PDB file of all heavy atoms in Angstrom:
ATOM      1  N   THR A 852     119.402  93.939  84.737  1.00  0.00           N
ATOM      2  CA  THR A 852     120.127  95.269  84.489  1.00  0.00           C
ATOM      3  C   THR A 852     121.294  94.948  83.458  1.00  0.00           C
ATOM      4  O   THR A 852     121.662  93.826  83.283  1.00  0.00           O
ATOM      5  CB  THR A 852     120.694  95.966  85.796  1.00  0.00           C
ATOM      6  OG1 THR A 852     121.468  94.937  86.479  1.00  0.00           O
ATOM      7  CG2 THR A 852     119.558  96.332  86.685  1.00  0.00           C
ATOM      8  N   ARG A 854     124.462  95.484  83.600  1.00  0.00           N
ATOM      9  CA  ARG A 854     125.522  94.850  84.255  1.00  0.00           C
ATOM     10  C   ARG A 854     125.080  94.078  85.522  1.00  0.00           C
ATOM     11  O   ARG A 854     124.023  94.459  86.078  1.00  0.00           O
ATOM     12  CB  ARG A 854     126.646  95.840  84.643  1.00  0.00           C
ATOM     13  CG  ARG A 854     127.197  96.685  83.528  1.00  0.00           C
ATOM     14  CD  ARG A 854     127.821  95.771  82.374  1.00  0.00           C
ATOM     15  NE  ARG A 854     128.203  96.592  81.220  1.00  0.00           N
ATOM     16  CZ  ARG A 854     128.455  96.022  80.050  1.00  0.00           C
ATOM     17  NH1 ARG A 854     128.294  94.712  79.857  1.00  0.00           N
ATOM     18  NH2 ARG A 854     128.814  96.818  79.027  1.00  0.00           N
ATOM     19  N   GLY A 855     125.783  93.044  85.917  1.00  0.00           N
ATOM     20  CA  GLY A 855     125.423  92.318  87.093  1.00  0.00           C
ATOM     21  C   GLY A 855     125.503  93.151  88.386  1.00  0.00           C
ATOM     22  O   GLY A 855     126.336  94.105  88.423  1.00  0.00           O
ATOM     23  N   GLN A 856     124.689  92.843  89.290  1.00  0.00           N
ATOM     24  CA  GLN A 856     124.629  93.608  90.633  1.00  0.00           C
ATOM     25  C   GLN A 856     124.486  92.475  91.716  1.00  0.00           C
ATOM     26  O   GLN A 856     123.770  91.492  91.513  1.00  0.00           O
ATOM     27  CB  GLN A 856     123.499  94.559  90.700  1.00  0.00           C
ATOM     28  CG  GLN A 856     123.505  95.583  89.627  1.00  0.00           C
ATOM     29  CD  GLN A 856     122.455  96.686  89.888  1.00  0.00           C
ATOM     30  OE1 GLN A 856     122.552  97.805  89.329  1.00  0.00           O
ATOM     31  NE2 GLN A 856     121.394  96.359  90.685  1.00  0.00           N
ATOM     32  N   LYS A 915     117.186  99.874  85.419  1.00  0.00           N
ATOM     33  CA  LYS A 915     118.468 100.593  85.309  1.00  0.00           C
ATOM     34  C   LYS A 915     119.425 100.077  86.349  1.00  0.00           C
ATOM     35  O   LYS A 915     119.102  99.500  87.383  1.00  0.00           O
ATOM     36  CB  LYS A 915     118.256 102.093  85.557  1.00  0.00           C
ATOM     37  CG  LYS A 915     117.993 102.430  86.959  1.00  0.00           C
ATOM     38  CD  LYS A 915     117.470 103.860  87.162  1.00  0.00           C
ATOM     39  CE  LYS A 915     117.264 104.226  88.597  1.00  0.00           C
ATOM     40  NZ  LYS A 915     116.767 105.597  88.778  1.00  0.00           N
ATOM     41  N   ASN A 916     120.750 100.212  86.084  1.00  0.00           N
ATOM     42  CA  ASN A 916     121.785  99.912  87.034  1.00  0.00           C
ATOM     43  C   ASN A 916     121.716 100.845  88.258  1.00  0.00           C
ATOM     44  O   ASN A 916     121.076 101.946  88.150  1.00  0.00           O
ATOM     45  CB  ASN A 916     123.182  99.939  86.370  1.00  0.00           C
ATOM     46  CG  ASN A 916     123.637  98.577  85.967  1.00  0.00           C
ATOM     47  OD1 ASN A 916     123.937  98.380  84.731  1.00  0.00           O
ATOM     48  ND2 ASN A 916     123.705  97.656  86.845  1.00  0.00           N
ATOM     49  N   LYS A 917     122.284 100.458  89.352  1.00  0.00           N
ATOM     50  CA  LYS A 917     122.291 101.127  90.555  1.00  0.00           C
ATOM     51  C   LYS A 917     122.794 102.616  90.442  1.00  0.00           C
ATOM     52  O   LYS A 917     122.266 103.519  91.061  1.00  0.00           O
ATOM     53  CB  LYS A 917     123.141 100.402  91.665  1.00  0.00           C
ATOM     54  CG  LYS A 917     122.936 100.932  93.030  1.00  0.00           C
ATOM     55  CD  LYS A 917     123.994 100.489  93.927  1.00  0.00           C
ATOM     56  CE  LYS A 917     123.626 100.516  95.418  1.00  0.00           C
ATOM     57  NZ  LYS A 917     124.770 100.184  96.341  1.00  0.00           N
ATOM     58  N   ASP A 918     123.771 102.821  89.613  1.00  0.00           N
ATOM     59  CA  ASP A 918     124.424 104.110  89.474  1.00  0.00           C
ATOM     60  C   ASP A 918     124.485 104.516  87.952  1.00  0.00           C
ATOM     61  O   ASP A 918     125.497 104.881  87.405  1.00  0.00           O
ATOM     62  CB  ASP A 918     125.785 104.178  90.011  1.00  0.00           C
ATOM     63  CG  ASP A 918     126.659 102.921  89.561  1.00  0.00           C
ATOM     64  OD1 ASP A 918     126.238 102.267  88.675  1.00  0.00           O
ATOM     65  OD2 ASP A 918     127.733 102.806  90.146  1.00  0.00           O
ATOM     66  N   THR A 919     123.303 104.463  87.305  1.00  0.00           N
ATOM     67  CA  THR A 919     123.261 104.547  85.821  1.00  0.00           C
ATOM     68  C   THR A 919     123.662 106.058  85.356  1.00  0.00           C
ATOM     69  O   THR A 919     123.377 107.005  86.046  1.00  0.00           O
ATOM     70  CB  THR A 919     121.840 104.355  85.327  1.00  0.00           C
ATOM     71  OG1 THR A 919     121.811 104.426  83.898  1.00  0.00           O
ATOM     72  CG2 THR A 919     120.783 105.196  86.017  1.00  0.00           C
ATOM     73  N   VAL A 920     124.233 106.054  84.253  1.00  0.00           N
ATOM     74  CA  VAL A 920     124.619 107.338  83.526  1.00  0.00           C
ATOM     75  C   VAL A 920     123.315 107.862  82.819  1.00  0.00           C
ATOM     76  O   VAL A 920     123.157 109.105  82.715  1.00  0.00           O
ATOM     77  CB  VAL A 920     125.752 107.195  82.572  1.00  0.00           C
ATOM     78  CG1 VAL A 920     126.274 108.515  82.181  1.00  0.00           C
ATOM     79  CG2 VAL A 920     126.865 106.262  83.141  1.00  0.00           C
ATOM     80  N   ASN A 921     122.574 106.932  82.266  1.00  0.00           N
ATOM     81  CA  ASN A 921     121.344 107.331  81.560  1.00  0.00           C
ATOM     82  C   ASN A 921     120.368 106.153  81.517  1.00  0.00           C
ATOM     83  O   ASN A 921     120.705 105.026  80.985  1.00  0.00           O
ATOM     84  CB  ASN A 921     121.693 107.750  80.116  1.00  0.00           C
ATOM     85  CG  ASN A 921     120.430 108.038  79.240  1.00  0.00           C
ATOM     86  OD1 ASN A 921     119.367 108.352  79.724  1.00  0.00           O
ATOM     87  ND2 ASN A 921     120.560 107.809  77.911  1.00  0.00           N
ATOM     88  N   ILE A 922     119.189 106.345  82.104  1.00  0.00           N
ATOM     89  CA  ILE A 922     118.298 105.245  82.199  1.00  0.00           C
ATOM     90  C   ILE A 922     117.789 104.684  80.870  1.00  0.00           C
ATOM     91  O   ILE A 922     117.760 103.465  80.742  1.00  0.00           O
ATOM     92  CB  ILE A 922     116.986 105.755  82.971  1.00  0.00           C
ATOM     93  CG1 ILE A 922     117.358 106.304  84.325  1.00  0.00           C
ATOM     94  CG2 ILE A 922     115.950 104.635  83.123  1.00  0.00           C
ATOM     95  CD1 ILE A 922     116.269 106.827  85.199  1.00  0.00           C
ATOM     96  N   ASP A 925     120.283 102.443  79.464  1.00  0.00           N
ATOM     97  CA  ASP A 925     120.354 101.112  80.238  1.00  0.00           C
ATOM     98  C   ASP A 925     119.329 100.202  79.643  1.00  0.00           C
ATOM     99  O   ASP A 925     119.611  99.051  79.272  1.00  0.00           O
ATOM    100  CB  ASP A 925     120.083 101.355  81.663  1.00  0.00           C
ATOM    101  CG  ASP A 925     121.478 101.531  82.494  1.00  0.00           C
ATOM    102  OD1 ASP A 925     122.492 101.874  81.865  1.00  0.00           O
ATOM    103  OD2 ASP A 925     121.423 101.177  83.709  1.00  0.00           O
TER     104      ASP A 925
END
Side-chain angles (χ1 to χ4, degrees):
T852 52
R854 303 303 174 196
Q856 306 186 159
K915 73 192 185 181
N916 265 121
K917 192 195 198 187
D918 50 9
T919 181
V920 194
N921 174 29
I922 303 179
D925 267 26

